Design a protein around this motif. Structure first.
Motif, PDB file in Angstrom:
ATOM      1  N   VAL A  76     -50.311 -49.675  -3.117  1.00 17.67           N
ATOM      2  CA  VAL A  76     -51.612 -49.503  -2.475  1.00 17.67           C
ATOM      3  C   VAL A  76     -51.461 -49.551  -0.962  1.00 17.67           C
ATOM      4  O   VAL A  76     -52.066 -48.756  -0.230  1.00 17.67           O
ATOM      5  CB  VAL A  76     -52.602 -50.570  -2.972  1.00 17.67           C
ATOM      6  CG1 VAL A  76     -53.903 -50.468  -2.208  1.00 17.67           C
ATOM      7  CG2 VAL A  76     -52.860 -50.387  -4.450  1.00 17.67           C
ATOM      8  N   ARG A  78     -59.141 -40.095  -3.833  1.00 14.11           N
ATOM      9  CA  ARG A  78     -58.195 -39.906  -4.921  1.00 14.11           C
ATOM     10  C   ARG A  78     -57.107 -40.970  -4.947  1.00 14.11           C
ATOM     11  O   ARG A  78     -56.215 -40.901  -5.797  1.00 14.11           O
ATOM     12  CB  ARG A  78     -57.572 -38.514  -4.845  1.00 14.11           C
ATOM     13  CG  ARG A  78     -58.546 -37.415  -5.240  1.00 14.11           C
ATOM     14  CD  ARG A  78     -57.880 -36.093  -5.615  1.00 14.11           C
ATOM     15  NE  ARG A  78     -56.874 -36.223  -6.668  1.00 14.11           N
ATOM     16  CZ  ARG A  78     -55.576 -36.410  -6.452  1.00 14.11           C
ATOM     17  NH1 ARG A  78     -55.116 -36.465  -5.212  1.00 14.11           N
ATOM     18  NH2 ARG A  78     -54.736 -36.522  -7.471  1.00 14.11           N
ATOM     19  N   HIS A  79     -57.162 -41.945  -4.047  1.00 12.08           N
ATOM     20  CA  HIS A  79     -56.330 -43.145  -4.119  1.00 12.08           C
ATOM     21  C   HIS A  79     -57.243 -44.352  -4.269  1.00 12.08           C
ATOM     22  O   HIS A  79     -57.508 -45.073  -3.301  1.00 12.08           O
ATOM     23  CB  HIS A  79     -55.443 -43.296  -2.884  1.00 12.08           C
ATOM     24  CG  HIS A  79     -54.598 -42.101  -2.592  1.00 12.08           C
ATOM     25  ND1 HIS A  79     -54.913 -41.193  -1.606  1.00 12.08           N
ATOM     26  CD2 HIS A  79     -53.441 -41.673  -3.147  1.00 12.08           C
ATOM     27  CE1 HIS A  79     -53.987 -40.252  -1.571  1.00 12.08           C
ATOM     28  NE2 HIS A  79     -53.084 -40.519  -2.496  1.00 12.08           N
ATOM     29  N   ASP A 112     -52.459 -42.415   4.033  1.00 14.03           N
ATOM     30  CA  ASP A 112     -53.801 -41.880   4.212  1.00 14.03           C
ATOM     31  C   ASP A 112     -54.329 -42.086   5.625  1.00 14.03           C
ATOM     32  O   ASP A 112     -55.376 -41.528   5.965  1.00 14.03           O
ATOM     33  CB  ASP A 112     -54.756 -42.508   3.201  1.00 14.03           C
ATOM     34  CG  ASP A 112     -54.588 -41.933   1.808  1.00 14.03           C
ATOM     35  OD1 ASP A 112     -54.046 -40.815   1.693  1.00 14.03           O
ATOM     36  OD2 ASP A 112     -55.000 -42.592   0.833  1.00 14.03           O
ATOM     37  N   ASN A 131     -49.989 -46.287   0.112  1.00 16.29           N
ATOM     38  CA  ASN A 131     -50.977 -45.221   0.012  1.00 16.29           C
ATOM     39  C   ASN A 131     -51.924 -45.260   1.196  1.00 16.29           C
ATOM     40  O   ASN A 131     -52.255 -44.225   1.779  1.00 16.29           O
ATOM     41  CB  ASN A 131     -51.746 -45.340  -1.300  1.00 16.29           C
ATOM     42  CG  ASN A 131     -50.948 -44.852  -2.484  1.00 16.29           C
ATOM     43  OD1 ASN A 131     -49.991 -44.098  -2.329  1.00 16.29           O
ATOM     44  ND2 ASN A 131     -51.339 -45.277  -3.677  1.00 16.29           N
TER      45      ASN A 131
END
Lengths: 49, 77, 1264
Positions: free
Chosen positions: C823, C796-797, C830, C826
RNA sequence: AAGC
RNA sequence: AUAUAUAUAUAUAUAUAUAUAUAUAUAUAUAU
RNA sequence: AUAUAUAUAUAUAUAUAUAUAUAUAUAUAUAU
């Protein structure tokens, strides 16, 4: 300390064999078996020794 | 061929379901099962037990047939 | 690869931990990046010697695809529509050949665009031309959903991975991530591109530009290629960065290929999005052997969401998976789409894990990461005709014999009703009564805040407002010549500044414009952007819902940032013996209509407000008189309050429906008006109302309906043991149910199953479709927990994907850097492998650091030095001869991180600087006798530091505008804002007092008088920029780069005067063998060590920061942080309490509590976090998931370990330094790689007093 | 046209 | 780096039992 | 007599816990 995995026991048989030849062979315990540096009663390992 | 206790419980559940259907509701307001009364010893008639107190694991006529067929004798060789 | 190493020897060696980084090498690599061509990148791709294991068949079906003719048709309304062959949902872009619609592009004969002649027949009215152009535009839009051309990312991956394996400084070994020779996605990418290109000398299947896309003229090109390439490049990046198992990546590639070979790629992905979850997460630990499960406790009040960590509990076979098996469903799904094999290996692999450890959660995360991550795209017409065309199914309605006579529009509900609506009515009744009794409701400032809340720089369908007003012959001011957008709600408010409510009454019944958003693995979402009067009249609904959510239930307000959510809730719910139930409402907005809900909530709100509010205006809305018919026979008139007037009008609107206006830009001749009853998504009352109704219905089920509809005693006992205040948490349409484990283990699964059936049945009779999941896993707000371990969802990223819904061109160059940094962050959240991720992030930052510009024959290149990225929070690798990989990305951003890393490597930096001839004679407190003033200038470090702070968006301010029209705009805005004379008098008193006392201490006092100016600037900045503003950007950046500097900002120079002393390590916060976040494991050393040394943040952030402010809410346009900073600056600089009173009066606080709060603030002591904001010190965003508070309190010692020193003395009245220095200690400890370390203050060069004077000087001089 |  | 002693880890190899589900036979209710 | 649902006997298929032994290398210690 006992190391049960070891499978050599020549010392045991030789101890018995020495009884017949007391007059020429004197079996003694090797000094390395004694507690290190005289040892002390405060050490568990020395107690087992 | 069911345990009589089990049939008593299932038979009560059937009555509760029929009551719910009659009242036209999802629940029956009046229930014959899961009451406060511990009716564990309740028994109901079943086809599991014959009139002799024995089990119907094998039909009575079959027992009679096996019993009577163990004595028959045939013509000589 | 030979050319790759030839071009990037120095750069790769620098960013791989072999040689020191330097600016010149970085810029050389950037130039090399700028000098490649597409086909060159593909020829580089040709040289990777892929291994056999990366081989798999590619079906020939992808290249050969039919025409688009059979997939479209024309309806009876002369609108282009999608022909459906697979079901009601086959309304996405089909997979059809395109080359026969392309006109060759000049100078690029191999590529072309959609034929312009076909566009001509389309705009004439031809049918086939319209079909063709719709297909072409929608295919272009589908191909435009990326951030930047894929070749950039591919080349950056090649450059990064050319450096080989990395050395772990903590593990003292080499990682074993397989090289590119085993990367199946790259091999598939290369093969498909080569097969498409074939003999033609150009290799790129298409070209992505700001103006759009150009297609390669091949007979094998298909519209489905771009999304397939995006998925393949995403998977290729993920495998190399996170060390994914190649076996799973192959399955993901297989799914992508099958999607391509189908009739519709997007539809296929949508229908098959759940293979990986249903086969790994929802079927996990069928046979359990052992492991650890965290012991958490939920304290009281549970409303406070207070959880405390206890420890680990060994697991056992007693707690194996007990939810119903889903094997039949998974097999059926796999069979229905011809992926039964993939399901087979997924299940077979899943059965292999019997222990709960790092390995199992890593496997689950890897499996979940393989889902596709495209933004599903479909034409707006199909979205409207598919989403607004379904209605609730009220299977058991409210009897018509249970209503009173009408009161205007509303109708009172009787109390004898057998329906369940009575409890909903009662709840809203009490909510409204409690709301209206609050004195703060009648405070003018509160009403002003509410009015300003919906005045934003975003669209509001102003045009429809305009003809709606013209329908009754009312002319609005035009504001001709204003360089601002008329299509903003600020413009609407300006035009609606001085009109009576009676004149604007009809405006609520106006139309509604269009608005769309695309999502990942989800159908595109539509929005109804209500206009200003609608937002104004929707207030009481919002207030009542807010009261319910705040008081009568358990409901969060956190955003979609992972940091701000309630991790403790999920981790507690997933841990055995607790069990979780995931409840979602399908099509929630479409399920709330006048039939059941609105007719009850509106009546309840209208009735539960009359007492506490009789005869008072509100929000500008006055009182009125309505007809009365409730009692039989008697029909009379009745006065109502302002809220009741709003309720009457809003009831009218709700009863009528909604008027959506559509203008499909991808379809010529597709525009109309659609009548719908779906609840709006763009209003302010959506989420709060949805949450309130969710909680109310759940409580009603648990209390009345459910107990009355089930007879199994176990179900009765369970339900009677559950209450919403203890067990249910809701937000919008997403909800979670917690089943507390009993003293005998965990609740029997059969009882839970029958209860779930009961909820499923209960949802239907008022038209709610309950999507219920019970699989031994906890999900909330798209966060996934298993056995107390949270599983990040990588898919989902999307790394390369970007949501674009409109046809507008993309952004100027500097904007993309923000996306790149996002990014990187993210990936940080993550939990990717940190070393590889840092290397790859450096590669991307290099690839995007240069830009050509034309300045009228002054052809220059814009270049960002490497230091600007470091200022932006990206950690270094190795510099100044230091050891490699000694920094962690928990580095703060801005001045804090800079100070931290200088403090860590100051001595090495000095020795390096001296050894290179940068020697001077003036001894420096920081650098001794090093000539830093010139080395920093030539290393561009000063230049990078300073240009990293320039606004990288165009500043539309300063456009020419007539004095008269601008002053009219400003006065109209101010007149709209300042309605009640009391507020105006308050602000005037504040201004007079401030001039008397506070004038001259600070130059920028926040005030309500500045709101119109900020609104005007925001509206102006919302317009489209032009070329000379971009030239302004370019010349400003060149001016900044060419200049020479001598120092950093005052704050950083002050910071460098402080030095610390590291000491023995901290104590472990949690057990070292307990999985908490998947991927954060020993193979991911540094995050693992930081997490186990500091400990996770076990308390939600929204409530924690709710107490770090003085004013909870302010007028939209002003910042609460700005006001707090101004107040604390005034207190620190010795201003008296009358100045603070004046400041509080400017923002509109009434005089008495103004004085009270001013005195209290002056004498009060404040928290470290709140106090540090005076110097713009904010907690780093990456720290949010850690327990930074305890480390502030008891691990940053401001007293030297050896005892008191002479310089470390804080002056008694300068105690705020105690707050600041804690942040410096925190930055130093967190920046360093490894475990958290107890830190002690060492020395301040100038002494405490001098540092205080410097800080006060900066505090006074800022704002000029 | 482009929400909260 | 070589030799000796002690210990951990991976890989290969071997056995039993039970339970669940499905199917066939028989019957009751509804339908033919 | 047949079909759907439910129950018993029989057969087949499927699923599942635990355990044991040797060498080398490596780790620790000693000697060179």
């Amino acid at each position: 300390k006992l190391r049960p995995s070891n499978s050599d026991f020549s010392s045991f048989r030789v101890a018995l064999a020495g009884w017949l030849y007391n007059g020429v062979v004197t079996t003694v315990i090797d000094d390395s078996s004694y507690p290190k540096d005289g040892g002390s009663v405060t050490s568990l390992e020395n107690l087992w020794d | 061929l069911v345990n009589e206790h089990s049939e008593a419980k299932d038979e009560a559940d059937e009555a509760t379901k029929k009551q719910a259907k009659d009242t036209d509701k999802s629940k029956a307001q009046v229930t014959y099962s899961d009451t406060g009364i511990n009716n564990a010893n309740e028994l109901s008639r079943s086809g599991n037990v014959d009139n002799e107190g024995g089990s119907n694991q094998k039909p009575m006529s079959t027992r009679i047939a096996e019993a009577t067929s163990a004595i028959v004798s045939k013509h000589p060789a | 690869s030979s050319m790759i190493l030839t071009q990037f020897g120095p750069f790769i060696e620098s960013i791989s931990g072999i040689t020191d980084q330097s600016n010149d090498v970085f810029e050389d690599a950037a130039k090399a990046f700028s000098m490649f061509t597409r086909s060159d990148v593909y020829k580089a791709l040709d040289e990777i010697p892929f291994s056999d294991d990366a081989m798999l068949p590619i079906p020939p079906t992808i290249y050969t695809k039919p025409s688009h003719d059979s997939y479209y048709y024309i309806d009876a309304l002369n609108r282009v529509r999608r022909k459906t062959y697979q079901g009601p949902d086959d309304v996405y872009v089909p997979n059809c050949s395109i080359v026969e619609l392309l006109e060759p592009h000049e100078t690029l004969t191999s590529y072309g665009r959609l034929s312009e002649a076909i566009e001509n027949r389309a705009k004439d009215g031809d049918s086939q031309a319209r079909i063709a152009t719709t297909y072409g535009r929608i295919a272009e839009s589908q191909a435009r959903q990326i951030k930047a051309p894929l070749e950039k990312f591919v080349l950056a991956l090649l450059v990064a991975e050319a450096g080989g394996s990395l050395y772990d400084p903590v593990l003292q070994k080499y990682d074993e991530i397989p090289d590119l020779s085993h990367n199946c996605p790259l091999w598939c990418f290369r093969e498909i591109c080569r097969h498409i290109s074939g003999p033609l000398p150009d290799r790129a299947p298409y070209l992505y530009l700001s103006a759009g896309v150009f297609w390669l003229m091949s007979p094998r090109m298909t519209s489905a290629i771009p999304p397939l390439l995006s998925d393949l490049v995403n998977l290729a990046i993920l495998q190399q960065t996170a060390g994914l198992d190649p076996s799973l990546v192959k399955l993901g590639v297989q799914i992508c290929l099958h999607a391509a070979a189908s009739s519709s790629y997007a539809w296929f992905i949508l229908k098959t999005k759940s293979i990986f979850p249903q086969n790994t997460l929802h079927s996990m630990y069928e046979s359990l052997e052992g492991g650890y499960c965290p012991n958490l406790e939920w304290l009281e009040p549970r409303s406070d969401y207070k959880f405390m960590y206890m420890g680990v509990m060994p697991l056992s076979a007693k707690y194996a998976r007990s939810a119903p098996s889903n094997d039949k469903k998974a097999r059926e799904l796999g069979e229905k789409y011809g992926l039964s094999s993939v399901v087979g290996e997924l299940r077979k692999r899943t059965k292999t894990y019997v222990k709960h450890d790092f390995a199992s959660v890593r496997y689950i995360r890897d499996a979940m990461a393989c889902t596709s991550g495209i933004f599903l795209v479909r034409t707006p017409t199909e979205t409207v005709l598919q989403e607004y065309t379904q209605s609730p199914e009220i299977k058991v309605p409210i009897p018509q014999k249970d209503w009173t006579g009408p009161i205007g529009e509303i109708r009172i509900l009787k109390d004898t009703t057998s329906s369940i609506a009575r409890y909903l009515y009662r709840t809203w009744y009490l909510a409204a009564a409690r709301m209206a009794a609050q004195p703060r409701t009648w405070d003018p400032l509160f009403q002003a805040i509410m009015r300003s809340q919906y005045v934003t720089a975003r669209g509001g369908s102003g045009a429809a407002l305009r003809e709606s007003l013209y329908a009754i012959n009312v002319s609005l001011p035009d504001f001709k010549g204003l360089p601002v957008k008329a299509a903003t709600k600020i413009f609407q408010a300006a035009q609606l500044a001085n009109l009576p409510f009676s004149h604007t009454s009809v405006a609520i019944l106006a139309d509604t414009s269009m608005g769309l958003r695309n999502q990942v693995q989800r159908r595109p979402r539509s929005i109804m952007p209500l206009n200003v009067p609608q937002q104004q009249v929707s207030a009481p609904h919002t207030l009542t819902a807010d009261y319910i959510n705040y008081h009568m239930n358990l409901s969060t307000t956190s955003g979609s940032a992972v940091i701000e959510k309630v991790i403790p809730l999920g981790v507690y719910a997933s841990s055995p013996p607790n069990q979780s139930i995931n409840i979602d409402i399908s099509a929630c907005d479409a399920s709330i209509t006048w039939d059941f809900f609105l007719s009850v909530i509106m009546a309840a709100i209208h009735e539960g407000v009359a007492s506490s509010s009789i005869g008072k205006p509100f929000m500008g809305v006055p009182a009125s008189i309505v007809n009365d018919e409730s009692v039989v026979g008697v029909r009379a008139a009745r006065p109502i309050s302002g809220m009741q007037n709003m309720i009457q009008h809003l009831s009218k609107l709700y009863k009528r429906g909604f008027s959506y206006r559509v203008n499909d830009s991808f379809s010529p001749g597709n525009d109309f008006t659609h009548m719908t009853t779906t609840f709006p998504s763009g209003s302010t009352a959506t989420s709060t109302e949805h949450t309130a109704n969710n909680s109310t219905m759940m409580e009603t089920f648990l209390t009345v309906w459910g107990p009355e509809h089930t007879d199994d005693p176990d179900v009765l006992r369970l339900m009677k043991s559950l209450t919403i205040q203890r067990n249910y948490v809701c937000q919008g349409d997403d909800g979670l149910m917690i089943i507390d484990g009993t003293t005998a283990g965990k609740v029997n699964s059969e009882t839970i199953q029958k209860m779930l059936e009961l909820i499923s049945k209960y949802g239907e009779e008022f038209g709610w479709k309950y999507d219920i999941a019970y699989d031994g896993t906890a999900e909330y707000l798209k966060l996934y927990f298993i056995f107390g371990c949270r599983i990040p969802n990588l898919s989902r990223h999307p790394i390369v994907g970007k949501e674009r819904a409109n046809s507008s061109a993309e952004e100027p160059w500097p904007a993309i850097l923000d996306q790149i940094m996002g990014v990187f962050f993210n990936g940080v959240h993550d939990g990717l492998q940190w070393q590889r991720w840092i290397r790859y992030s450096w590669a991307l930052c290099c690839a995007f650091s240069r830009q050509r510009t034309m300045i009228g024959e002054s052809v220059g290149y814009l270049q960002y030095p490497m230091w600007s990225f470091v200022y932006w929070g990206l950690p270094l690798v190795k510099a100044f001869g230091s050891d490699p990989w000694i920094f962690s990305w928990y580095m703060p951003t801005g001045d804090l991180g800079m100070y931290s890393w200088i403090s860590l490597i100051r001595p090495l930096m000095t020795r390096w600087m001296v050894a290179n001839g940068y020697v001077t004679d003036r001894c420096s407190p920081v650098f001794g006798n090093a000539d830093y003033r010139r080395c920093f200038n030539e290393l561009k470090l000063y230049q990078g530091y300073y240009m990293a702070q320039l606004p990288r968006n165009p500043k539309k301010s300063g456009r020419a505008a007539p004095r008269e029209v601008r002053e009219q705009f400003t006065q109209a805005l101010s007149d709209y804002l300042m309605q009640n004379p009391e507020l105006k008098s308050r602000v005037l008193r504040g201004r007079s007092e401030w001039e008397k006392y506070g004038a001259g201490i600070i130059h920028n006092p926040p005030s309500l008088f500045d709101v119109p100016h900020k609104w005007y600037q925001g509206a102006q900045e919302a317009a489209i920029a032009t070329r000379e503003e971009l030239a302004e950007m370019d010349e400003t950046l060149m001016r900044a780069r060419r200049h020479s500097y001598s120092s950093f900002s005052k704050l950083l120079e002050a910071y460098l005067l402080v030095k610390w002393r590291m000491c023995e390590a901290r104590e472990p916060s949690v057990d070292l063998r307990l999985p908490l976040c998947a991927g954060i494991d020993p193979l991911n050393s540094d995050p693992f060590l930081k997490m186990v040394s500091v400990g996770p943040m076990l308390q939600s952030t929204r409530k924690y920061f709710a107490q770090t402010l003085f004013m909870a809410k302010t007028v939209s346009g002003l910042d609460v942080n700005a006001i707090d900073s101004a107040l604390l600056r005034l207190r620190t600089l010795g201003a008296d309490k009358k100045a603070l009173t004046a400041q509080l009066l400017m923002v509109g606080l009434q005089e008495s509590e103004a004085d009270a709060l001013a005195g209290k603030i002056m004498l009060q002591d404040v928290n470290t976090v709140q106090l540090a904001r005076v110097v713009n010190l904010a907690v780093p965003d990456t720290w949010m998931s850690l327990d930074f508070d305890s480390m502030f309190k008891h691990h940053v010692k401001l007293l030297p370990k050896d005892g008191r020193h002479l310089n470390t003395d804080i002056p008694p009245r300068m105690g705020w330094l105690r707050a600041i220095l804690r942040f410096l200690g925190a930055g130093m400890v967190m920046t360093a790689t490894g475990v958290a370390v107890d830190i002690y203050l060492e020395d301040i060069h100038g002494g405490g007093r001098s540092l205080g004077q410097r800080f006060m000087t900066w505090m006074r001089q800022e704002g000029r």
